[PDB]
Amino acid sequence: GLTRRKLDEAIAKMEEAGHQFTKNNANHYSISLSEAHMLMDAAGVPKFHER
DNA sequence: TTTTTTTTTTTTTTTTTTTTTTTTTTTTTTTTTTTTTTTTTTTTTTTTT
């Protein structure tokens, strides 16, 4: 449920760190499930409890 | 008057989602064949003339 602009904001906040968004056989960003968790953990979306 | 770097055009390739067609398997289906109960036909004996 993250709009494209929100997801680009999240990856602009995240990617400059040491993390690399692992790509599959192609360049397509193959964000692992844990990668997605971390991304939206620090993306700024409050959890169902922390909100 | 010249050079360097970055933000825009466009171009190329891949994955996921959603397009169609065919075959195999499953369901409803009358014809033919098979099974059972039966009304008509055949045989013998006893009694009477």
From TrEMBL:
It comes from the Bacteria. This is AAA family ATPase. It comes from Vibrio cholerae. The lineage of its organism: Bacteria, Pseudomonadati, Pseudomonadota, Gammaproteobacteria, Vibrionales. The gene is parA. The chain holds residues 50 to 100 of 405 of the full protein.
